[PDB]
Structure formats: C-alpha cells, structure tokens
Design a protein around this ligand. Structure first.
Ligand SMILES: *C\C=C(C)/C=C/C=C(C)/C=C/C1=C(C)CCCC1(C)C
Ligand SMILES: CCCCCCCCCCCCCCCCCCCC
Ligand SMILES: CCCCCCCCCCCCCCCCCCCC
Ligand SMILES: CCCCCCCCCCCCCCCCCCCC
Ligand SMILES: CCCCCCCCCCCCCCCCCCCC
Ligand SMILES: CCCCCCCCCCCCCCCCCCCC
Ligand SMILES: CCCCCCCCCCCCCCCCCCCC
Ligand SMILES: CCCCCCCCCCCCCCCCCCCC
Ligand SMILES: CCCCCCCCCCCCCCCCCCCC
Ligand SMILES: CCCCCCCCCCCCCCCCCCCC
Ligand SMILES: CCCCCCCCCCCCCCCCCCCC
Length: 265
C-alpha cells in the first residue's frame, strides 16, 4: 500500500511517533470544528454580497472535519502495540492506514477554496466564468493525478515522481490564475484591502506548497536516508496538519477580514 503501511509492517512505530501522530491528527480535525463555528457565527459581520464566502468556508470546514476525523481513526485503529518489541505494528486484522480520506477532502475543498475569492474580489479584464472553469479543471486534475502517483509511493518510485510532476503542472496553472486574480482584485480597492490581498497571496503560496512537500517528505533524504523512517511519517503528517490549518481555516479568516474592509465605503 503506502509508505505508512510499509513502516508499520517492516519496522513499526515507537510509541512516541505513534502517539505523536495520533495527537497531531486530532489537533487537525478539532481545529476544523472550531473553524466551522467561527464561520457560521461571523457571517453577520459581512454584507449580504460577501456572505457566500463565509458559506463556502463553513462547507469546507464540514468536509474537513468529517474526513480528517475518519483519517484520525484510521491511523489509530490500524496499528497495535507488540509487547515483545515495544513498538506498534500494522495490524492484519484492521482496515490498514488509508490516505484516501485526505485526497477525497482535497477534491472537495479545491473548487470551493478557489471559487470563494471570486466572491470577495472583483475582476477587471478577466471573465468570471473563464477564471472559474480554469480553477475547477486544473484543481481536479492536480488532485486526481496526485492520487494516481500516490498508488506507486512504495512500489515504483519513478512513477510516483512523474505523476507528482504532472500534478505540479496543474498546480502551477492554478498559481498563475490566482496571481492574475489577485492583481485585478487589487485595482480600485483601498490600500488597507490591498494589504490584506497581498497577505492572502503569500499565505496561499506557502500553504499550498506545503502539500507537495509532505508528498515527497520520506524520499527527500534520498532513497535510504533519515526521513525514510517513522520520522518522515511524523513530519509528513505534521506538514499536512499545518497546511490544512493554513489553506482551509486561516485562508478563510483572511478573506473574511478583507470583506469587512471592503464594507468601508
Ligand atoms: C485542503 C484543501 C486544499 C486546496 C488542498 C490542497 C492540496 C494540494 C495543493 C496538493 C497538491 C499536490 C501537488 C502539488 C503535487 C503532489 C501531489 C499533491 C496532491 C500532494
Ligand atoms: C472575532 C473574535 C475572535 C476570537 C476567536 C478566538 C478563538 C479561540 C480558539 C479556541 C481557544
Ligand atoms: C480576525 C478575527 C480574529 C481571528 C480569530 C480566529 C479564530 C478561528 C477559530 C479557529 C481556531 C481554533 C484554535 C483552537 C482550536 C483547538
Ligand atoms: C463571535 C465570537 C467568536 C466565536 C469564535 C469561534 C468559536 C471557537 C470555539 C473554540
Ligand atoms: C459537502 C461537505 C460534506 C462532505 C462530506 C464528505 C463525506 C464524508 C465521509 C466521511 C467518511 C468517509
Ligand atoms: C478520483 C480520486 C480522488 C480521491 C478518491 C479517494 C476515495 C477514497 C475513499 C476512502 C476509502 C475508505 C476505505
Ligand atoms: C460550488 C462548489 C462546486 C464544487 C463542490 C464539490 C467539489 C467536487 C466534488 C466531487
Ligand atoms: C498581518 C496579519 C497576519 C497575517 C498572517 C497571520 C497568520 C500567521 C499564523 C498564525
Ligand atoms: C513544486 C514542488 C515543491 C516541493 C518543495 C520541496 C522542496 C524540497 C527541498 C529539499
Ligand atoms: C504559514 C505556515 C508556515 C509553516 C512553515 C513550515 C513549517 C515547518 C515544519 C517543518 C517540520 C519538519
Ligand atoms: C488582519 C489579519 C488578521 C488575521 C489573523 C490570523 C490568525 C487567525 C488565528 C487562527 C489560528 C488557529 C490555529 C490554532 C492551532 C493551534
């Protein structure tokens, strides 16, 4: 299956790496529940015309709470302690760790997080339907090809890499279109909102880049190095959780602040 199930079957997990990974992944879904309440409760502070952005954030929160909770359980319930070795090992009598929950979550969120900025910023010379359709197409393909390449994570490394680069192509298309969007979005609005739009752009850039970083993390120290272990698994799930909080929660808080700033007129 995956690099996680490999380590779980071929070397096992120190209680620290196991309990750490369960804790960070719990942090993950708990934060999505906190954000859900935040977006619902704040929806009154923004004019009707921006509220659709809050709505989309609330929906993203629901789909990340539900799927990142499924994955938390999947990770905990997939390994059992061995008293002889004192380490956690993949259980043959379980579901086995399965990261489809995460890709299913990305496939849902991606249209919604890309669509929502289009409800707070106005374009200048670009058409709303062109940006939208371009976001949705390459957002879906980025994920689908990323899911395919992930089927070869442990087995064929070279396929894992060439698919990753395919999925990166679509990612770079999205970063291109988002940059145009942020440029046209800057025209006209106050300097304060231009400041927030620039913050949104940097956070969008880093936070989305963390995801390919966590996809390559075990092989980053070579095909036999330090991260090729329970420590790369630890780091991979830590980066993911950081990327989840930033691109899903923090992103929508920033768009909310912008919308309020745009109601000063
Ligand atoms: C949770 C919400 C979103 C928008 C998640 C986004 C995830 C990514 C941008 C993942 C990207 C990948 C890339 C760029 C290439 C390797 C495979 C990944 C799917 C991890
Ligand atoms: C708007 C007011 C912002 C307060 C939000 C504080 C969130 C606290 C997180 C849980 C502690
Ligand atoms: C700009 C207004 C103030 C920002 C408040 C952001 C609060 C977001 C709520 C989600 C964060 C919860 C963190 C603790 C949960 C565990
Ligand atoms: C309007 C008050 C701000 C609500 C904060 C969201 C609740 C966070 C729960 C933790
Ligand atoms: C539209 C937002 C709700 C999406 C939920 C996705 C389905 C959750 C599945 C959890 C267990 C599998
Ligand atoms: C097109 C593929 C996008 C992601 C689909 C992954 C679905 C996995 C569902 C979880 C399986 C739980 C068992
Ligand atoms: C307005 C949101 C349109 C996309 C939501 C669902 C994303 C893909 C689901 C499969
Ligand atoms: C300048 C306003 C703050 C922008 C970034 C805030 C998020 C940093 C991580 C918390
Ligand atoms: C576009 C893919 C970005 C991957 C970031 C990983 C950088 C590894 C540095 C070593
Ligand atoms: C806005 C979030 C910034 C996160 C920076 C990257 C976090 C580094 C964690 C690396 C662990 C190895
Ligand atoms: C004007 C810009 C102000 C943006 C505030 C950004 C900070 C949002 C705080 C939410 C972070 C929740 C993370 C909690 C994880 C522990």
């Amino acid at each position: 299956a995956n690099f996680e199930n490999f380590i779980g079957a071929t070397e096992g997990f120190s209680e620290i790496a196991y309990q750490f990974t369960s804790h960070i992944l719990t942090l993950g879904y708990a934060v999505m529940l906190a954000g859900l309440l935040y977006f619902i409760l704040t929806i009154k502070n923004v004019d009707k015309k921006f509220q659709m952005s809050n709505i989309l954030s609330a929906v993203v929160m629901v789909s990340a709470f539900l799927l990142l909770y499924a994955q938390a359980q999947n990770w905990t319930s997939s390994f059992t302690f061995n008293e002889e070795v004192g380490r956690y090992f993949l259980d043959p009598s379980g579901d086995l760790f399965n990261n489809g929950y995460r890709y299913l979550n990305w496939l849902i969120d991606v249209p919604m997080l890309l669509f929502q900025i289009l409800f707070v910023v106005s374009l200048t010379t670009s058409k709303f339907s062109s940006v939208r359709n371009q976001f949705w197409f390459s957002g879906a393909m980025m994920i689908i090809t990323g899911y395919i390449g992930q089927f070869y994570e442990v087995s064929n490394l070279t396929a894992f890499l060439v698919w990753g680069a395919i999925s990166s192509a679509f990612f770079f298309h999205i970063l291109w279109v988002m940059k145009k969007v942020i440029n046209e979005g800057k025209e006209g609005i106050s300097p304060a909102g231009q400041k927030i739009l620039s913050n949104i752009w940097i956070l969008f850039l880093i936070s989305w880049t963390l995801y390919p970083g966590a996809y390559l993390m075990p092989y980053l120290t070579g095909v036999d190095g330090f991260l090729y272990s329970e420590d790369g698994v630890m780091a991979r799930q830590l980066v993911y959780t950081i990327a989840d909080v930033s691109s899903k929660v923090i992103y929508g808080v920033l768009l909310g602040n912008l919308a309020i700033t745009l109601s000063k007129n």
